[model samples]
Target chain A: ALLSFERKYRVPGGTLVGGNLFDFWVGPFYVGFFGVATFFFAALGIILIAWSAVLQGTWNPQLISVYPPALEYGLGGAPLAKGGLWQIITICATGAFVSWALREVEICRKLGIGYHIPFAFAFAILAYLTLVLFRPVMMGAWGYAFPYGIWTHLDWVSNTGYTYGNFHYNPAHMIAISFFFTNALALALHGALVLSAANPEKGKEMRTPDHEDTFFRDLVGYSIGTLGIHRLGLLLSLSAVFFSALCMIITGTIWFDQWVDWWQWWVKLPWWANIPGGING
Target chain B: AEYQNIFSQVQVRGPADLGMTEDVNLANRSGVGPFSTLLGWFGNAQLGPIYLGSLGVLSLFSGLMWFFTIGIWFWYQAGWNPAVFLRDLFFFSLEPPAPEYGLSFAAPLKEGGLWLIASFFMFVAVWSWWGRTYLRAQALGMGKHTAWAFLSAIWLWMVLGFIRPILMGSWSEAVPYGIFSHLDWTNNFSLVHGNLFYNPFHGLSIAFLYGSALLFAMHGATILAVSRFGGERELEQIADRGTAAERAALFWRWTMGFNATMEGIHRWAIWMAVLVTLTGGIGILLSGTVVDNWYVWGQNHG
Candidate 1:
């Protein structure tokens, strides 16, 4: 059912590339140039993935895996049915992701809102590109990229971690993991804080942001304020994903040695050299 | 010599010398070239006193640029080691008298020294915000308590994160940059101190933290119960029932009686929350310094 207020917001003409040609919404979805691009790319990618599964005689989702070109293929493009389908699918996926972000931009422009939503989506796209494109290209092979599959991607991460003599020791990985953990802590605090503010006991008055601020101030002597908490949450989550991408990108391209061995700089330091209970001693 | 000549030409006794006079030629201002002229124009046209008064804004940006440039060099030298890069930038120490090295010069300031400098800047940043808040409150005739609250919070962080680390004589003792490493440090430190939980201050900190959470829970529930009575109604209908403020106050009055005021409850809650973090900071600081082994201290005291 169309909302009564939907018509008010539907008044549009904020198309970036197509002018007024594709500005209108088809039912609920806005069909901008990028929206059409998203649909086209997503449809093609899905079809290709399904076709690959069919050709491999496995409709079973668990067993199905679209491997990248072998290391021998290197920078060169591979033949069809080999890694070509995977490569083309990757391109389509990129197209869809980029198009989706652009569509978000278009919506933001139409609504006269800030580009924060699209900017946040761009970080996720960056992570994807970093994993598939940046890391693979830097390593001089398409094979370095994780395969498009359910179980296979996990296998790739596990194998890739062992390749570097334990991914846990990777400093960037540690940071990413910590960020993820802290993100959870912040969200939990925020979610509980917000919900608690909204949900008063039976026959009670709903609280205001002032109350929320006062609550934190009264307890911790600080609130960060309601708006401040939201800003904090946004930065925290973005940093988590950003560091995760960095962790992956650093694996093969930047550092190939065991992460444990990376601490040699500390051992080699002159100040620590003659210490009574040091690594050298 | 050309640079010296430019400097000499621009040099003046005071503001009177720069004014429209026979000796002063604005066109002949050598060192005060296009950029300064542009800045002057910008100050006159747009920002007024903001641009003219604050050279610190430019200095802050330039400082950040220098830090980033130096940071990138350190990052490359560290072979992209996140821990090393972060530790180098922040100058955190793990032990006393952290390692020092000179770059073709004498009197090397180690990571701990850099950490101290950074902490001072951080305190300044927080102090500046508190100042702004206080000034704003004075201008608006409200929020004086808020300014005090923020200043207190800044001191709490400064004492815990900076002052204690300096007293300990190592940035390393502050906190590790790594995730698991920091956790490991905490775990080891606590175990070595004979169970930090046994410490009186630690116990007090936990109690305050819990107390703060409980207070908020009660405040939230009381407010919501009164304001959000089921079924959608007009503003008039809601107003007819009772004003939200009165409804909220009524809940507290009925439950906790005349002893508790709505404003008083919130005031108490804020102090409780502040005490939680403040005590927590004190608990950690005492762990290594005053009470080496909290469990042993507990045993002796008991």
Candidate 2:
């Protein structure tokens, strides 16, 4: 059932570990060693979650939560209900995520493509680590890790932000939000322009890149070109990710007090408060 | 039944356009939400975002202000010494007026005079850029509507730092030039004025901002899915109708019950994006001066 093209490329050499053993495709999915690893890790993680839900005696989505240990359990293990389940689940999640990326890596090799897929995915993992591992360890308590629940994580975010006095005052937070919004704008621009050319009327010939380029030139006097827009989109989207992680990582790790007070340095500048009668006057 | 034909032709094949695929291959497998792509960019430190931490944003913004106003002049005054320039850039901070300055000017040089001077230069810089944008559009013989749409942000920036302060009759109402200071000012402004969420224009701003993201994600999924056949290939579609465009049209119409023309969709995105800043600006402008307590206003109005 293999296509002519895929048949040519799907030969067995791209395996990172198990050589020719698990190099075959099961339907559309490429079953690498990591695929099996992914199944075990993901399955174990989900099972643990379900067990946690069962043990907690609530299937009520919003209320049932897998919370970390209390502050006393500083980087240490805990009882099953006292965030031990969360710890195991975190390990499972990390395993599954890395396994999936490895699977992606194998496929990329098979296709003879750049490793951008896994590289970009590593950022996603990096952020997950920030939430579960990095930030929590920095804070010296697993309790800092967000609870796993429908409404609980959100509540955690609100409670956490309130503690900061104003999360928006966090510069990285602002930049992250800006990048997120900008990413959308860029996508919308690219989407509309591409679709404009990609789809014409019933009879009219579909438009060309010249038309696409011309359309933007007519509007904004510039089009970031085809490749240029792709690069822009990647940078914007990735920036959104990196900044969001940085926002969390910077807080509690280096800064403790109100985010608003980060500006104390500004008010304390030489021309302002430091001047003899400036602030007083 | 020729099952091989179905699987071979439809499933087991390269993407529709291999060339365009590599150009935009990243979209091939995106995660559920934005956060799901979490920390994927940490692999290459060099290849990641421009801003790493808080100081990153500081440097970018501070350097921007310096470029537009003081960096060149100060370099000249410092006899163009790189070491001196670097020292000043690292140590000296460009600041706004002290709150006590009120609506009037302070003493020269060391006082709020520098603030006043720097602010004037910055305004001219923005104004010049706006003009340059307009001039470039004219040179291209294009519609000036893009430039017009951009003024929404210009209006917002001006209103925040200058116009609104003038209206309120206090230099204290304005933001400082420092990176963290301006953001702190924003937080203070929102808190002191009233609950920002209670303001109606805020709702509109959020709507447009969120709507833009939703629209963008929707557009991405649609284009990526349809690309399996002939999505990226534009001219190939007209020779054969009922292809990628029509399929996507049916997909969307089936989902949303409306087929937005390409032109209409583009206009829709731009309108929302422009309105986000415009409506937020209005909300900020109305804060303190017109409606001091938005929560109370909401309580009464609704």
Candidate 3:
């Protein structure tokens, strides 16, 4: 009975008091949307690449085991393992490479602009090196054991002995990662809120002189930096921030408070905090 | 029978107890909603901490003032103890039963620090709204009409924002309905008067009521910010800064378009992140209940 009153009256009206009722009410709904949106974005990317592959007469290899339950996956989970095999091939053989070639051709055709072949190849090689080599080293470390390698040993020795401690006690890498994931998503949401409100047709409604420049900048930057530079990237970035902030907010509160109340609740600690299977206290 | 058992357990008998037989009973019997079921889940050893923690963090950041609002209200609730109304005017009093017990920050200045950050942004958001209002009104050529209305609206918002918390702080003293007190007002009245049944539900109601309120505030703010319908005129006005339509078009094009895109992305992102974290964090809280059960079993085993 009390539960119903809380849901109808207390929950909404309770927010006006600023206790934390709103997070409980709104957090779940947001999570559901994010789960579905990312899935949609991932599917769309694969479809586009497959269509391109068919046009180019390339037989793209079918891949599977891309996504998983929310607990195991972050950022649409295993982007490469899913339609990535086809996606990579399609981009290289079709538009991504072709577009570069066409841009070079246009320069020569219109103003007799000279092309440097070596420069183009250098760009491609560098792109492959960064994307193929550096990225996995950077972001693919999710869920992987930390301090498992020699370098990590040195890192631990220099920093602190390795342990999967709470957020407050975790290593610098984890802390850096925690903030990075958080800030990145914040920036993304900032973009999305702007887009939905101000640019329904994307950037089509407003024409800018710097549109081409900004597009190329983001394209080349995000392409080399991550993989692609489209609305999908923005979407992913936003989703990351949203989830990260939520987690941080939760983790920051209880974990920090636990450290403080470690003494007062010391006796009750074994009853609640110590016997853990779930993640709250 | 179950109510009898619960009442038996809650007959407080210590100095630690603060006398709340009326409030708890009302809460238990109030039939709040589905959300309370969720809150009940939190209250059970299963998910309470996670829910509490989320509220604590929120109090730290965006809504700490809200907590102060709650704390002051709690101090007020301690003094008020609304359950007395049934006794004072047994026939026709409509005054809601107040919560019993006191409010405390899970962390001391730590909670305050989070609030400090919240205050900074609270200031910024208010200033942004003000700036946006002024710029939009001037661009729209509403003359003084825009300025007057915007200022008035903001003034009202600010006043309410400030005073509501103070008023709520006073109101927090209301007694708990079911856990501390019961529908049979006579038993509760006698027990409380006799200095029995104090701190009846171990301050759970205090935490839940105020904690739930904090979460609601956050949901409301996010909803308002994400809506986007009301903010169009402001954007158009900001876009009007450019001289020629083309130039003005360009400015609006980048600023408005880029920002809107960003916000849309942010809205979803915020939702996703929040959901995942809550699920995980809350899951942890739920797990503790199993552990607690095991401990109870262990005690029996011994």
Candidate 4:
């Protein structure tokens, strides 16, 4: 399926770990060291998930579950039938994701492009780490991580949010949600705008970025130019995940109280907060 | 057709327009280039009026408040000391009525009344801004769906600050004006209602919230990937199928046996987003007055 033009850029040399050993392609995909690593880890992790499902006697993805060890086991490994499989799978999934990210980096290097793609992807990995590893480690128990089940993970999120007494109050969560919503709006605008420019009447020539600006300017009085719109999109989406990680990590690690009451600093401020006959007084 | 309704315009012609495409560089297109989008951007109002429109007004009002609300505390409570005021700014928040106030107004200016004033001003300003949004849509010759979608979020903010409290019959139920204070208000509200997670509308909000994210990434990637092949011919691709569209439709149909036309995708995403905000507000309203304890209500219903 490789295109004719692809051959000009397919020459390799960006292998990171195995020197020149994996500096080649298998068909269209480059087989750098990390590519092998990703394949191995992803296969191993998925196999374990299937194995766990078989033991549970349900191929139904909804019912299949691999739970972490209870808090009684702390940081140690559990028995195979218990939570032990989850630990191994966690390691495998992490390895696979990291490997994939590195493979992307290698591809970017081969093409002499900026590492922006890999760098943005790292935030996605960071948010995952925040949930499965970082937050659990800080809380001192593997049990803190959600069970690997289609439904159980959601249940864990619900109970966990309840534990914090109104996680919606978490400012970082608010910001992440904002970015998430705004990211969608921007994407919609960009998609429609581009489609318009590219699709003129049957015989007419294509439109230019000038038309892009004029459309937005006429509507909103300003336009983030074509390149700038993409730039804005990248920042919006990246910040969404980054803040999501911060929102969760802050919960158990630093702010363990009801998320709303974390605002006591304002209530205790020495100015009007301390003024006689105020609400707090 | 929907977008064209919103943004219809013209084209150049004849020898005068010939080969001018090369001049379609950064400045000619947007008046500002790569770096100029930044603010003063090294360009000032040339970046467009910072104080011109509704969004401008929104930011300015909030920015002014961001300072005044924080600054006033130092004068009245921090003994007029600059150091004490600025340092404790994040923690300085006005509060709602105490439990004793019930449905009655609080002692004005001194007690919880500042919060009421803040709430009223905020609601009016935000609601009026919604007016500007609708007018903008109408003027631009598009459906007012943008305006309608926006109000779901605006009303949710209002429900928390205004409607929910009145429904429950107590000024004590309203949110406070502190950055952290308002957040804490949500915590207490959940606890008071005996857990909001069991509320079905709450669940739907999260569903659509996450669903919108998935929809966005799918549409975003699909458009960008096929763009180089002129698949950006969105309408044409919906029915006529260019080379890019053919490949796009082929990939999706091979994977899932269906494809959403370009317009359908937008409608799907917009409605998902709209539903998230509305459902979130409904969950809040159901608690205390309507359901008391959502967990118990869910147990009985389930």
Candidate 5:
């Protein structure tokens, strides 16, 4: 049975790429061409993971990690038993993630809504792509890509962090961390402010956004207001993930030195040499 | 006698004290009595009743209760000397009195009585503040879910800031009051976990934090853009038409042309914010207890 609201918005013939072939809804879910593609890739990826596990002779979740080729394999393709399974899996994952985003796009088109949802998901895809493909390719090795295992992935991060002599010292990591912290602060204020406006004592009316602005203004002499906060939040979150991706990407590709040593330029600066107790002095 | 002298100065009084009827009568004659005047100011103010009135009252009450309990603890620590307690409370003393002098649960009521009372009041203050927000939402017929969502942060703080410390057998595990000392403590704590930034949960928390900020920025900007009129219109002229709900829809349509409804934006913004604090709370809780030496953990796995 179609939902009362669904009947109104489920107008036909808004397919972006697939014509009217798969433009129908199946039990409230829109099964566009992209939806089909999404299912195919996702199912294939899952099968690959399972097959890899079976071949590895252990289904123990901890031990059943699908690893990329050894460092010696470099940019070239590895044998099926080696890193080839991981490569195909990566492809399948990307295919599924992209297909899912496109499905969102089709839904947006059908409903006459904006494409912001798909745009936002694209950032996540970008981060994943950077981690598994972009960074590894740029560094001339598939082995640098993290393995697909719960414990193994953590091991990868730990090993990588140590490899760069403390990931904490990485500038991009710092910025990413700072963005995350600031996001928390911003959200706390926004959430508290919104609830404060919406909820009033019994017999009192709810407030408008203007009241929200005034409350924040009274407290801090400025309200990002109701609208400005959302924009700030989106920017902060996107930048956070972007920087996180950048931090990891730069580790072996652009930066090979210990992260702490990256600050040596500051110590060696000519201006600092004149200072009485500064590094150069 | 001092109270009697003050009371005698008042021209009118009711049975036992200045009753509500007498206060109202005084306001009628004098334009507004002090209490009513304050209440009037609060009523006219553009803030939520629960927020400005209830939460404010609860916070002050709890704050005072905390102050007295801590003060008494200080008094006991200072060998029951008033001056010592007052001095330590206000000034940043270089050397804090020994932990032995401070309250502890291990010592039970004999030693940690004031600390226990202070913590209890602090918890009450937080709970009341949250409860008032929830009730206000219920009263106003909006944001009930939002009120509930905020409990994540409150619960996070309670678990990490109070509950965990108590469970871990020492109030001292909780972050201390002193500023510099707290910083030192944090630094020492981080070192104990081999650089806490390397912790995966910490990283996740940071990401969530940044994500929430981004959501707020977009939501705020979108609302403002929609509400404001195009060039040369006076603020008052733009108030009705420019601030219309359709204008917001149109503005977002023109700018982004995708998935940008006011309601959709708000939903995303709320989740982003909630996740930020929730992840942060989880990260803090897991730092020393669940994962020690995150760097080494990664190494072992790698």
Candidate 6:
């Protein structure tokens, strides 16, 4: 229901920004500053993207859920509650830069950035600040935002709602099911996969062993292929992860659809009106 | 053995004072006045000492028994029928229905018989170990084992852990196996016997038991490392750098660091347990087949 609502309220022709709540507390001031600075830096980002686009002739903002619109402008221009498209674009550009910066750290690590605890600390600080600044605007619906402050947020549908002021709080069996059967199971599998990958024995034989050996052998084969490890137990865990992921997608979809019409119920309730706006102040 | 015999004679007074209504056992009805009776019991200081002494002795026996038994008698239960004679006791909920694989009070003793026996041993064990520990801690001015004391606070912990199923008429529901069957003891002790790791649920059960086992292991390791109880020379020989104070400081640091690591493992295990509960429930829910009736057979075989 929330996802469909997200799809319905998707911002048209704006850059995407996938933001995390953890980002807020670390860099709220920076994010707020980004909001305040969006008019300028966004223009710079746009200039860079436009330069790339004009040169390469392609422009895709992919404006994912990063933050809500009003706060993105930071007391400048029209507020987020009143849809401002340019402000949304600028907000998204800043999110893109943040994303780029994160990716850049990976690039740097690849390029031999020596152990830099300070840089990591900076990332931590910025991430927390972002969460803090965004909390007020996005606190009501606990999720991440995308598309330069457009209506996208983290997939709250994956989690069961305990009680939201007056939202359609159906007793969800899916959350429990998904968490236990899917997420936890997947995590166990992932652990196995990683452990097997780290093992030395499995990497010795067959380029890619087909599933003919013992079940354990097949598991080791698949896991080694996936991560390259000889540890039989770990191989099994890897298989579990894959299985869990499959379970998550299948169960999450079913669970997601079950309450697809919940939005109508939410809108009808006067009490729900208090949820979104009241979150900011 | 002699002390054990003496303690055995102290019949624990049954649930006479814990009955629900006075007229349920009519002969003793008149003495049940509210405040007057409470005051009368309070005035009987000698009786209070006797009760306290009984509790103390029982607690000491329980502790020693548990130490000797170790993992053998880890099952928990309530020790006795609810003490309905006490006014406050009547406020508590009575035991649940006789579980499947359970025996009713009237059921022949053979069915849930072992549990009643186990509970008897466990009560004595817990009382001996925890009771003695409490007294020792008080005398030595050491911090008591809060978990043991808390468990002792109400008789229900013992009952729930060891004996409640018997009271509920379903002794099999009390522990991992139908009872602490001779077979269970053999399996636990057997060199060839391993937990059924093939069962998906077995992974979870092992995780729970091993998590607990790990803590005990850590405790053992700490005690060994410190050598405080004895063998000071062993620690000194292994100890790198500095005098006694420095060595102790190093030991303390290592212990704390190890503790933090173990604490993380404990938390992780608890997390797994939480997941297992949900997963196990889902397994049952999906099946929707009630095994209670089938399980009841072994429980009521007596």
Worst 10 residues of 5 chain A by lDDT: A272-281
List the candidate numbers ranked by DockQ, top first.
4, 5, 2, 3, 1, 6
Q: Write the per-residue lDDT of candidate 5 for residues B66-165, one digit (tens) a residue.
A: 6676655545545554444433332221222235643344545544444556767777777876675465444334445545666877867776667656
User: Please, what are the lDDT tens digits per residue for candidate 1 over residues B214-235?
Assistant: 4443443333233233211212
**Most accurate candidate by DockQ:** 4
The number of residue pairs in model 5 that clash at the backbone is 43
Tell me the spans in candidate 5 whose CA falls farther than 4 Å from its real position.
Answer: A60-63, A274-281, B1-302
lDDT of each: 0.55, 0.62, 0.29, 0.64, 0.59, 0.30
Q: Count the backbone clashes (under 3 Å) in each candidate.
A: 26, 10, 103, 10, 43, 89
Q: Order the candidates by TM-score, highest first — what do you get?
A: 4, 5, 2, 1, 6, 3
lDDT of each residue in A152-210, candidate 1, tens digit only: 88568657876876466778877776665454444434544443444433444554454
RMSD (Å) per prediction: 18.4, 13.1, 27.1, 9.3, 14.1, 28.6
Across A1-281, the per-residue lDDT of candidate 3 in tens digits comes to: 12211222222211112233222322212112222333345456556555544544555343211211122443233354333343344334334343333333322222112222212333333334333233323444222212222232333332222122222322232343444444333323332233333433333343221221222121111111111112223223333334333333333233333222332343244444343222121
Pairs clashing within candidate 2: A122-B40, A123-B38, A123-B39, A123-B40, A123-B41, A124-B37, A124-B38, A124-B39, A124-B40, A127-B39
Error of 6 at B277 (Å): 15
lDDT (10s digit) by residue, model 2, range A148-267: 986578568767887998797788988989987787667545654554555443444455665555445433334444434544555666677799899999899899798867866655
Cα lDDT tens digits, model 4, B1-302, are 21211111332223211112322222322232222323322111233211135553674486466456534643565456555455454545676777677767655665776666666656656765666555443333334555566677776776777888888777777776666566567667767786666688887987887666555544544444455565444545655555555444433332233556654665675677777778888888777777988878967874
| Residues B63-83, model 3: lDDT tens digits | 445334433433333334333
Q: What is model 5's DockQ versus the real complex?
A: 0.08
Model 4: residue A178 alpha-carbon error in angstroms: 5.1
- TM-score of chain B taken alone, every candidate: 0.58, 0.65, 0.20, 0.75, 0.62, 0.33
The per-model DockQ list reads 0.02, 0.06, 0.03, 0.11, 0.08, 0.01
Q: Using lDDT as the measure, which candidate wins?
A: 4
Following a full C-alpha superposition, what root-mean-square deviation does model 2 have from the true structure?
13.1
lDDT comparing candidate 2 with the true structure: 0.62
* Residue-level error in angstroms, candidate 3, position B75: 29
DockQ-based class of model 4:
incorrect
